[PDB]
Amino acid sequence: ATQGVFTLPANTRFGVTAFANSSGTQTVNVLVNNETAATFSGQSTNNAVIGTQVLNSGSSGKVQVQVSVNGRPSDLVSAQVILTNELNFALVGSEDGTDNDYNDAVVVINWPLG
């Protein structure tokens, strides 16, 4: 199935944060209105926070996460979790290789803010 795609409430602020756990340099693209709105990059095997940003979910609310390592797209896994009918997490893991730990870039989207 498609992974890394989340429908947020439209025109709404959200946080997006990426962590790295791989020998390979991660490039994380966050898309709003179907175009890259933020790019994070780094190289860490100790969960470095390679980027964090506040974005707006855009006209449709559709937010997409894509991850690449040396120009090759990583395989994604994702889910959305809601606590007390109010607090939202959109979660992405990604795999750049063969060990299937899916932590090579980890992305956490959260809303509402403020």
Ligand X SMILES: *C(=O)C[C@@H]1O[C@@H](C)[C@@H](O)[C@@H](O)[C@@H]1O
Residue ranges that bind ligand X, judged by CB under 6 A: 21-24, 45, 96-97, 99, 101, 104
Question: Judged by CB, which is closer to ligand X: 58, or 93?
Answer: 93
Per CB under 5 A, 24 contacts Ca ion:
no
Which residues in the chain precede a discontinuity of more than 2.5 Å between C and N? none
Cα distances from 64 to residues 9, 30, 92, 107, in angstroms, run 14, 6, 10, 11
Residue type, 47: N
Q: How far is the CB of 24 from ligand X (least distance, A)?
A: 6
Cis status, amide bond into 73, omega within 30 of 0: no
Q: How far is the CB of 9 from ligand X (least distance, A)?
A: 34
Which contiguous run of DSSP H or E holds residue 80? Answer: strand 75-83
The binder of 23, among Ca ion, ligand X, none, by C-beta within 5 to 8 A per type, is ligand X
Per CB under 5 A, 101 contacts Ca ion:
yes
Contact residues: Ca ion, CB under 5 A: 21-22, 95, 97, 99, 101, 103-104
